[PDB]
Amino acid sequence: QFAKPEDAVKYRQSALTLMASHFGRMTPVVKGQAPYDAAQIKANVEVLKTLSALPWAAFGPGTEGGDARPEIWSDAASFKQKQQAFQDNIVKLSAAADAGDLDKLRAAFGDVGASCKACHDAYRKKK
């Protein structure tokens, strides 16, 4: 769906921005600094699940650019493993949210965050 590589870059950056907001906005809830409404969090994690599937199709071959490291494309299998593993961490978060289980939500939230970082460490350039 992208006319030029720049369009893929803009898409993925926008998708990742939205994911970051839907993930990060739960930090106060996880920490107990904001109240835990199970229905609110269930709905939010549903949005996050949808968003978390979107960036990867915008790293198609030849869409080098932005702050993407070239290693994304020189080992396609390894990058795919990282995004699929991340999406499975989101599945654990979804299961916790759907169950209304705050303890599971906290644990899953931590693992999701670690998975964001694991990918950045291998595949995102320094600012």
Which amino acids are annotated as binding site for heme c, given as ranges?
12-13, 67, 116, 119-120
Q: Return the structure tokens found at 110.
A: 């931590």
Q: Return the structure tokens found at 54.
A: 């979107």
Least distance (Å) from ligand HEC to the CB of residue 39?
A: 22
Binding map of a copy of itself across residues 6-45, x = CB under 8 A, - = no contact? -x--xx-xxx-xx--x--xx--------------------
Residue 15: closest CA among 2, 26, 29? 2
Residue among 107 and 116 whose Cβ is closer to ligand HEC: 116
The alpha carbon dihedral of 33, 119, 66, 10 has a sign of negative
Residues 38 and 35: their CA atoms lie apart, in Å, by 10
How many other CB atoms are found less than 10 A from the CB of residue 23?
20
Q: Which does 111 bind (CB under 5 to 8 A by kind): ligand HEC, a copy of itself, none?
A: none
Q: Which residues bind a copy of itself (CB under 8 A)?
A: 1, 7, 10-11, 13-15, 17-18, 21, 24-25, 47, 50, 54
